[PDB]
Amino acid sequence: AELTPEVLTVPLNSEGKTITLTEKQYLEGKRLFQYACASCHVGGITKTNPSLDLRTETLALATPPRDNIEGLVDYMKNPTTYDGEQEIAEVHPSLRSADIFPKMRNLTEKDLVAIAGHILVEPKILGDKWGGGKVYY
Amino acid sequence: ATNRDQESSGFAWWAGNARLINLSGKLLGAHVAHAGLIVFWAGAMTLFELAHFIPEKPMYEQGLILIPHIATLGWGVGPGGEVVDTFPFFVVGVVHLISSAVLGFGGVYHAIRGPETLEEYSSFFGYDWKDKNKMTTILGFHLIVLGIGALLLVAKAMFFGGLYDTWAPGGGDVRVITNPTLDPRVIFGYLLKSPFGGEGWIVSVNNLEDVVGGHIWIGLICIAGGIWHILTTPFGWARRAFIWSGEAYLSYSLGALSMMGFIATCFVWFNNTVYPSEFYGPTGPEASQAQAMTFLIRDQKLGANVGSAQGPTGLGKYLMRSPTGEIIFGGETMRFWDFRGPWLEPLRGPNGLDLNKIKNDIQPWQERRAAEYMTHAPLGSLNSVGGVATEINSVNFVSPRSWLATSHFVLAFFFLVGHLWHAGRARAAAAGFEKGIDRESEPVLSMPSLD
Amino acid sequence: ERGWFDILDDWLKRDRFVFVGWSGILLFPCAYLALGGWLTGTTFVTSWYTHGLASSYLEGCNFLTVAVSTPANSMGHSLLLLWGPEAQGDFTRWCQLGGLWTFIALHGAFGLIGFMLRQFEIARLVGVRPYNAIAFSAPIAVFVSVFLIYPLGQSSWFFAPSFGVAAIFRFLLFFQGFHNWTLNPFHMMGVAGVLGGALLCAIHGATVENTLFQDGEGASTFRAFNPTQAEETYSMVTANRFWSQIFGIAFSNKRWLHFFMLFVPVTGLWMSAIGVVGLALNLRSYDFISQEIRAAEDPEFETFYTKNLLLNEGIRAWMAPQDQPHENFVFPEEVLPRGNAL
Amino acid sequence: TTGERPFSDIITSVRYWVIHSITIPALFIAGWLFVSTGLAYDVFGTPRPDSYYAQEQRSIPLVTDRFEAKQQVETFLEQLK
Amino acid sequence: ANLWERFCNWVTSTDNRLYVGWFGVIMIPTLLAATICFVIAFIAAPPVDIDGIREPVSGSLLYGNNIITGAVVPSSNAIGLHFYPIWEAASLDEWLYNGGPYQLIIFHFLLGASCYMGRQWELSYRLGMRPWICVAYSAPLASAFAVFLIYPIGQGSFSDGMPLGISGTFNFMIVFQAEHNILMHPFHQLGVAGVFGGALFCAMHGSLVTSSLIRETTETESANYGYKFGQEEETYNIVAAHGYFGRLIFQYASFNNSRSLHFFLAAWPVVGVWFAALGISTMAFNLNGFNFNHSVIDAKGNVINTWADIINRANLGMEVMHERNAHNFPLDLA
Amino acid sequence: VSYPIFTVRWVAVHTLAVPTIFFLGAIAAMQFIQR
Lengths: 137, 451, 342, 81, 334, 35
Ligand code: CLA
Ligand code: CLA
Ligand code: CLA
Ligand code: CLA
Ligand code: CLA
Ligand code: CLA
Ligand SMILES: CC1=C(/C=C/C(C)=C/C=C/C(C)=C/C=C/C=C(C)/C=C/C=C(C)/C=C/C2=C(C)CCCC2(C)C)C(C)(C)CCC1
Ligand SMILES: CC1=C(/C=C/C(C)=C/C=C/C(C)=C/C=C/C=C(C)/C=C/C=C(C)/C=C/C2=C(C)CCCC2(C)C)C(C)(C)CCC1
Ligand SMILES: CC1=C(/C=C/C(C)=C/C=C/C(C)=C/C=C/C=C(C)/C=C/C=C(C)/C=C/C2=C(C)CCCC2(C)C)C(C)(C)CCC1
Ligand SMILES: CCCCCCCS[C@@H]1O[C@H](CO)[C@@H](O)[C@H](O)[C@H]1O
Ligand SMILES: CCCCCCCS[C@@H]1O[C@H](CO)[C@@H](O)[C@H](O)[C@H]1O
Ligand code: OEX
Ligand SMILES: [Cl-]
Ligand SMILES: [Cl-]
Ligand SMILES: [Fe+2]
Fold this sequence. Notes:
The structure is cut from a larger assembly and holds chains A, B, C, D, E and F.
Chain C: H1 4-12, H2 23-44, E1 67-68, H3 91-96, H4 99-126, H5 131-153, E2 163-164, H6 165-179, H7 185-209, H8 236-247, H9 254-280, H10 289-297, H11 304-323
Antiparallel strand pairs in C: 1-2
Helix pairs in contact in C: 2-4, 4-5, 5-9, 6-11, 7-9
Chain E: H1 3-11, H2 21-44, E1 71-72, H3 92-97, H4 100-126, H5 133-155, E2 164-165, H6 166-180, H7 186-211, H8 238-248, H9 258-283, E3 287-288, H10 307-321
Helix pairs in contact in E: 2-4, 4-5, 5-9, 6-10, 7-9
Chain F: H1 8-30
Bound molecules: chlorophyll A (6 copies), beta-carotene (3 copies), heptyl 1-thio-beta-D-glucopyranoside (2 copies), CA-MN4-O5 cluster, chloride ion (2 copies) and fe (ii) ion.
One chlorophyll A is lined by residues 41, 48-49, 52, 63, 65, 384, 400, 403-404, 407, 410, 414 of chain B.
């Protein structure tokens, strides 16, 4: 089995447009997710709020939908609750709260896309283990 | 090769440094060369930490132990422990590294080229271990040096920019200490505190005024005592109580360093004042309390009434009483209710955690800190996989607190062993039986039978 | 000498750097193959087809995680000979079927026989009593009970221990969760003979070193001894008094002391072997029936014994699907035993 | 004192090193190549990182047939390509 | 002489059937207190709320235990590291519910055993012996300190100290595995090497000396009669033993020096057990065993399990079940 | 004085030494394998 262009092809937007990520981008997405996100989202769960995971099906039912690059990139600039109703930058790392989450300070637009690409690619590799928690270890 | 084999010295190669006991020049070489190794590591390790350092990630996510020591002195850091200038870290690293070459020079000279004994050469620098007067005199010099070191800390805190203060009102910041605690009832009162839970002996020190004031005392005590030992010779009861020999004195020092090692271990494990959590990561008690805080915050946001929420055991799921009645976090963290930290204290009233402050006054910065600390608990594997033991690979983390506590416990323990080794050897050699029992003067053969 | 047998005997028994002997003909090839088979498998060989695991340096495992793993459960107790009906002489397939497992286990078993025959042969040539060979029956009883009898009582070699550091750790934890092996009084006697042997090893070495006669001028005292000297190097009389007064009793007979040092760990290993023969049949000390009857009727009755069975139940449910892949276990999340939150 | 040349004689002698400064490196390089050529995988039947699973395959190629396990592994292996 | 002088002379007498000594002046009362409290609690103590959740665990014989299940149960998680002497309790009934006897026993025992170690130095000095038997005993003593004091300090509670009981001990082991992956820790591995190797060298030494005893008895008598307490002559032939063992392996693998041999016998288990003790004492601060969970990944990123991952699954079973009513939040952080 | 080269010892040494070096070369190469 291989990490093919097909595995690396994910939804770019809500309208069904895709983007094929490169292997460099895949590497970069893992690296940067570990850098900025994994302390809470290791393996696609959320340690400080286990009801919300990073599974693609969960992301699709978020508002606005987060099951695509655009929705994930926007989440990283201006995160909201799952219903889209409150802006939670003050308690969740984002570009807009890089003052209080200093690890966000040097993330570029390119980096956000790489991290979003990791979130969509990993469950295509790991299936239910992604967002599964200890049951699936 | 004066004394440099077993035949001459009576000591095998693996005990080769015992060949130095009565060779004050070469022994001074060993000591100075060794001090160079310590200064060397301090300088090289700091430069290494600096070279690796990404200023926007927490120190504690970066395997740093020395930068945090420098930052706590108030160098390089601003509000919240934000790094504002790495140059001070650079200076500390460079100055130690340069200094170690000098010490290393002195060590190599004394050890290899200088006079092997100093006594013929100088009577001020020469010494006999059995000369009680010279021993307390050298001890007194070192006491004065130590006293001056403690006062340097005071000088930093009071006249040269202050110290990092995690407790600063409005948030952690560097603060100049102007009113250091001088009252001996407070300063020496720490020494008589129980080392058990909720007391913590000296590890409980929770404000920089006490820290500064204690070093004022300690600097004065060390300088006074050093003078004392330069001007006196040991009292008769002292002479009768101790063994007077190089190996005996090594042993007393081994015991003392063992004790200090254990103390340091508990200091880094529990104390978040002189080991600010901004730099060293949360303590174990802190991260466990931060977890309960995190879920209290979350579930109360969802509408839970956290004061009245009865957990599966009948004890409150979020909030319960301590054995003396104080309101504390529930679940397993009940054990950690002695914990105190800047992000939590605003919620504490005279009766412990205050439910009205909980319901109304939790600020976003408290939620963030509690989530950060919960997710940087000092648990992780020897290969630096952060998390509980069943965690999958992803997060490269072991807390600086775990590294510092574990290392110092190992050192303190083996130092206790060396104390027993050397204290018992010193006794035996002083009485003349360290090489074995005299076959024609076997003491037990002159004793009456037990039965 | 005489005939060829006696000329062979001569050469076999030459005094050389590595003594050979008649036992050497069995020992050397078997030990060599058991060891080389282990290094070969751990370096190069997978356990993907037998266990669904990587197990070699070649696949990325480290010294702790490599193993030569047991064959698949469907192999039963096949000898799994290279030329047998399973591999049919194909070396590659034999490796993938776990043939290195029975290779190592069986050459290892013959090698231990050869080693103990070695101890007998050398004792007889040097003219000493063969107590070292006798002590070595304890390693043999352990190896045979655990690596042969245990899996022979179970469904297949699959359940024998795999040859690896982490693999053996897994074997311990399996025995706890499935057999409650810590509760077993033959294991407890094993533990007593191991820890009591380590205790006797330490205390006897320290006592000799601390009751030495001054037999030289050196402060390093090892040179002040001669293998040929008539005299005891340390004082039995002083050592006896010291312990009599410290502990209340002491050895007074050096011969008894040294026989007891053989006795304790040898007996403890033999006791552990018997408990493992029982575990071959699942004949466990798993439960105390009186505890269970009480706890079933009284939901407030709790002991450390009831607490440990809860741990066992977790171990079985959480580890079985991956540890026993031939069972095709699927345990929906909802059935897994878990306490609150965790 | 059993006869053979003492090891410390042998390993400090120029001649030992003339022989071994070639045999030691040659063996090491042959071991290297046994891996770097891929040959190790085929001799022992060990999967390459791309050969544990087919692209979409769900489960592990576990042997389930004692006497036709060999054939099973063979079928399991074409089902990759 | 004066009373004090005679007292000192008696305390330090080399002539007492059991040596007393100054360490003994502390050791005797503290060991007696721990022993008496232990025996009475093990027989008769009521159930103890070890985990502070009002779920009392029965340790004693009269309350439904046998020798294997019985324990003196650790003090309550509500107490934590707080010092809980009898006089801190409102009543003996409260003291008992909260596991007061555990603290009393372990504090007296640790103090008494540390004095036992001092006393070993003390007598060796009175007898003109070399002094390091007490250093050998530091290894078991360090290990007792690790499980009864250091570990509870690290984790913030005596409720996580090792229980004083046979099944309790196994409970501590299993939970310790879930929480620290001790088997994968090199210091515990060195401890295993220390105790398995100590057993091995114990049997080896016993068998080598026994094998070379000099003929001094007839076939009817125990050979043990061939040695007489206090004789000057060594009772076996070490050159014969070395002759045997040097051939079993190879010449330079065997000791012909008894002093080096006996030093090795002391050192190997003592050092290994010091690392065992330091393993527990550093996992006390959560520096844990190696974690290779999901370390092997294929070309796509599928996890290829190793024996480490199978360990992990057994560890997960222990973790999710242990103290099944005590956790409310998702991480077990102490 | 004048020593034999090839002995039982010599053979013992090379049965072990020879594969050891070969294996060490194999394992060194492995450290550069990427998935
Ligand atoms: C300030 C600390 C100090 C000092 C100055 C001394 C000094 C001395 N000791 Mg003591 N000792 C100490 C602490 C100290 N010791 C501790 C903490 C222990 C407990 C282990 C001992 C136990 C001890 C013993 C058992 C003996 C001495 C002896 C001696 C004398 C000879 C030492 C020698 O030549 O070693 C030479 C050095 C070596 C052979 C190297 C030791 C290697 C260590 C054990 C490994 C360290 C591992 C390392 C940290 C990590 C790995 C590194 C890497 C290469 C992988 C000398 C007077 C001897 C004696 O009593 O003389 C009177 C003796 O027999 N010491
Ligand atoms: C901190 C480690 C340390 C230090 C500072 C010392 C110090 C010393 N030892 Mg000990 N020793 C140690 C560890 C140490 N030892 C260990 C680990 C062992 C066990 C292996 C020993 C075993 C041992 C024995 C058996 C003996 C000593 C002796 C000595 C002394 C004489 C050395 C000599 O004759 O050199 C001769 C060696 C040389 C000429 C080679 C070069 C040595 C220099 C110092 C190298 C310096 C390198 C450095 C990079 C240069 C920087 C220069 C720059 C600043 C300009 C010297 C004071 C001897 C003694 O006691 O004499 C009375 C003695 O017999 N040692
Ligand atoms: C107080 C001592 C101390 C402490 C608490 C630390 C802590 C740390 N170091 Mg520093 N360091 C030290 C001393 C220390 N180091 C020394 C002496 C050196 C020179 C070798 C270094 C050079 C160094 C480098 C180059 C790096 C670190 C890094 C780190 C971090 C990761 C450590 C790790 O992964 O360990 C792995 C664990 C081990 C290797 C196991 C050590 C166990 C020893 C061998 C056992 C000791 C037993 C005892 C002493 C022997 C007694 C024998 C007996 C018979 C008597 C961590 C914060 C890393 C980091 O993140 O930098 C930012 C890093 O890259 N350190
Ligand atoms: C504690 C360390 C120490 C001690 C007790 C000594 C003691 C001695 N030294 Mg050694 N030496 C040392 C370290 C030490 N030295 C270092 C670090 C070096 C490299 C710089 C040397 C290089 C050296 C040489 C090349 C020679 C000596 C000589 C001497 C002898 C004469 C010294 C004298 O009369 O000065 C009298 C006093 C002064 C000259 C004024 C001292 C000024 C100091 C530097 C002021 C700083 C004070 C402050 C407290 C320093 C803190 C340092 C700390 C932070 C590390 C005497 C035996 C001589 C000897 O062996 O003759 C045969 C000799 O030729 N020393
Ligand atoms: C490294 C520091 C150091 C060292 C090694 C020494 C060493 C010595 N001192 Mg000196 N001293 C020092 C610093 C030091 N001193 C300082 C800073 C001062 C000023 C306060 C003094 C003032 C001083 C005086 C006034 C005297 C000494 C004396 C002595 C001698 C014997 C002391 C003794 O028996 O202690 C052992 C301690 C006791 C016998 C006290 C009773 C034991 C209790 C029960 C121990 C309780 C502590 C316990 C472990 C708890 C720890 C923490 C606790 C505080 C809560 C010896 C040469 C004596 C002397 O001979 O002068 C020439 C003496 O009269 N010193
Ligand atoms: C003393 C040395 C010794 C011993 C006791 C063993 C023992 C064993 N080996 Mg090992 N082996 C050895 C040396 C040894 N081997 C050497 C030097 C090599 C390198 C060539 C091997 C390579 C090897 C491999 C590759 C394998 C074994 C296997 C085995 C097992 C099955 C052997 C078998 O069934 O033989 C049956 C044969 C005999 C018992 C010989 C009997 C002699 C009789 C008395 C006379 C026969 C005459 C006969 C009538 C004439 C020919 C027959 C005719 C009808 C056609 C068994 C554990 C297998 C195993 O481990 O599988 C898991 C396996 O695959 N060995
Ligand atoms: C006696 C003796 C000994 C010991 C010795 C010793 C211990 C020594 C020490 C020594 C030392 C202790 C040394 C040191 C040195 C140092 C140096 C030489 C330094 C230099 C520095 C530099 C050069 C720097 C540079 C820089 C800068 C400035 C900046 C940044 C970058 C860098 C870092 C590059 C022994 C054991 C051998 C044994 C025998 C005897
Ligand atoms: C800085 C600081 C502080 C302060 C401190 C102090 C003030 C301290 C002190 C300290 C001290 C002041 C200490 C002391 C110690 C002591 C000791 C440690 C002792 C010892 C002893 C001994 C060891 C003895 C011995 C003996 C005996 C017992 C018997 C007889 C014999 C002999 C002599 C051997 C505080 C906390 C506030 C805060 C933080 C910082
Ligand atoms: C199986 C088989 C066989 C056989 C084979 C063989 C016989 C092999 C051998 C092999 C070998 C014979 C190999 C070897 C290898 C080795 C190695 C791989 C080593 C390594 C080592 C190391 C790595 C070291 C380490 C260490 C230690 C141990 C301690 C000190 C420190 C250190 C870390 C250095 C045959 C053909 C018959 C048939 C079929 C099958
Ligand atoms: C031996 C070290 C010599 C160098 C001492 C440097 C002085 S330290 C300097 O002092 C300033 C106030 O004067 C502070 O504001 C500043 O933070 C601090 O860096
Ligand atoms: C593999 C060894 C077992 C067989 C031993 C039977 C020996 S058989 C024996 O051998 C003698 C030479 O030693 C001959 O001289 C004699 O004629 C012959 O009968
Ligand atoms: O108590 Mn006894 O065990 Ca040490 O973790 Mn947390 O807490 Mn409880 O869980 Mn898991
Ligand atoms: Cl439990
Ligand atoms: Cl909890
Ligand atoms: Fe012996």
